[PDB]
């Protein structure tokens, strides 16, 4: 079978999370499940494994009594809860499956894996972003082409999708990745190649989409009168 897991989630250092692990099909209520975590910068760690048919918890000694697991038998899914978030929680969890066998070794194995929940936690929570339109200068243009774009500054959280004239123009477009600011913000940019003969006939509008915050700000670009 296949196990599908939810998308990215953002929480706070001292709140509770809610991640779900559902399985499409069967063989979920008969075999033990587990949770595997991968973090960029170190190795993979295993917090604990839970039997769904018996409902018995089995954690590791490296993790204290802070997290909890519950399993559901009717709709065949499992829930993740973690309270009092910390600075190293910014990683991705995986919903694994345990299959036993017989032999001299008898080691725990994870044949089936989920998709992943990228949970990132920091300060500088979600707030209304601001857009700054940019226009090329007279000295910045030498040939028959010009560069113009829109800037998204002080936005939260990832990810964001931008469009040019609601997808009307897609040739020469480029998207830049975000970066971890010192205060906890992000920044991206998007510039496109525009010929110099079309700076006064038709207009370009930048669309910003922020589905966690449900904001859509339309901005107009205007050429500078001085240079």
């Amino acid at each position: 079978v296949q196990l599908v897991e939810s998308g990215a989630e953002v929480k706070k250092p001292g709140s509770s999370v809610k991640v779900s692990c559902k399985a499409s099909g069967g063989t979920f209520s008969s075999y033990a499940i587990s949770w595997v975590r991968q973090a960029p910068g170190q190795g993979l760690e295993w917090m604990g494994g839970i039997i769904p048919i018996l409902g018995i918890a089995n954690y590791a000694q490296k993790f204290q009594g802070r997290v909890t697991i519950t399993a559901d038998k009717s709709t065949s899914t499992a829930y993740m809860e973690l309270s009092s978030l910390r600075s190293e929680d910014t990683a991705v969890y995986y919903c694994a499956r345990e299959n036993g066998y017989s032999g001299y070794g008898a080691a725990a194995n994870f044949d089936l894996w989920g998709r992943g929940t990228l949970v990132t936690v920091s300060s500088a929570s979600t707030k209304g972003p601001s857009v700054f339109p940019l226009a090329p200068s007279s000295k910045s243009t030498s040939g028959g082409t010009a560069a113009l774009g829109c800037l998204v500054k002080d936005y939260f959280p990832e990810p964001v999708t931008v469009s040019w004239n609601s997808g009307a123009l897609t040739s020469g477009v480029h998207t830049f990745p975000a970066v971890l600011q010192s205060s906890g913000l992000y920044s991206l940019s998007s510039v496109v190649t525009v010929p110099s003969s079309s700076l006064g006939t038709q207009t370009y509008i930048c669309n910003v989409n922020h589905k966690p915050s449900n904001t859509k700000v339309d901005k107009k670009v205007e050429p500078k009168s001085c240079d």
């Binding site: 190795g43 295993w46 000694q61 490296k62 070794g105 992943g116």
Partner: protein, 213 residues
């Protein structure tokens, strides 16, 4: 922690490349089996081989797993176009009372020829000055590989505060582009004469300046 994996391993496309997993005598030399997983950067890891004796379905025979006493070895024949991932050594640890993974080895050669970078410098607009901040953008495009250092100067002293660099990404024409931001305020934005970016790519240094006044 208890398992130490090589950071990386060098090889050639057509020769045999091997890796070794070394731990303690209570987890892998104890008698427990080991499992090797492939960590592709972008997809969830899957199962490759368990117990070093049975081949799972969908896994090619080119992967070989062996147990030389207290150490485990993985051998591959031929470097194809999907080994750009991480190899981990996982086994049951009795002292930790659970499964612990290894460190991870990177199998990736640079393979990046040179190119000619181009930089664009854009001064902030008029509406950005009233936001009580000054975001200095500095865009570099059409360069390869994506390893460019960023330096900021104000014609009298280097700037070591507010310097950021973003990770370049592949373009449509198999190129790379990156942008640099600097966080200032319009209080001293107009006081200085000019601002610039200084970058270096294999000894090629280009300088572009703007005049706020």
């Amino acid at each position: 922690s208890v398992l130490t994996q090589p950071p990386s391993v060098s090889g050639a496309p057509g020769q045999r490349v091997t890796i070794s997993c070394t731990g303690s005598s209570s987890n892998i030399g104890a008698g427990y089996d080991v499992h090797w997983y492939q960590q592709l950067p972008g997809t969830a890891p899957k199962l490759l081989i368990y117990g070093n004796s049975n081949r799972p379905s969908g896994v090619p025979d080119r992967f070989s797993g062996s147990k030389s006493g207290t150490s485990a070895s993985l051998a591959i024949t031929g470097l194809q176009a999907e080994d750009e991932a991480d190899y981990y050594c996982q086994s049951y640890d009795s002292s930790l009372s659970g499964s612990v993974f290894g460190g991870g080895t990177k199998l990736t050669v640079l393979g990046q020829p040179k190119a000619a970078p181009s930089v664009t410098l854009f001064p902030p607009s008029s509406e950005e000055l009233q936001a009580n901040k000054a975001t200095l953008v500095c865009l570099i495009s059409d360069f390869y590989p994506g390893a460019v250092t960023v330096a900021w100067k104000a014609d009298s002293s280097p700037v070591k505060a507010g310097v950021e660099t973003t990770t370049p990404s592949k373009q449509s024409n198999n190129k790379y582009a990156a942008s640099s931001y600097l966080s200032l305020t319009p209080e001293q934005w107009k006081s200085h004469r000019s601002y610039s970016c200084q970058v270096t790519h294999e000894g090629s240094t280009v300088e572009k300046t703007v005049a706020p006044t």
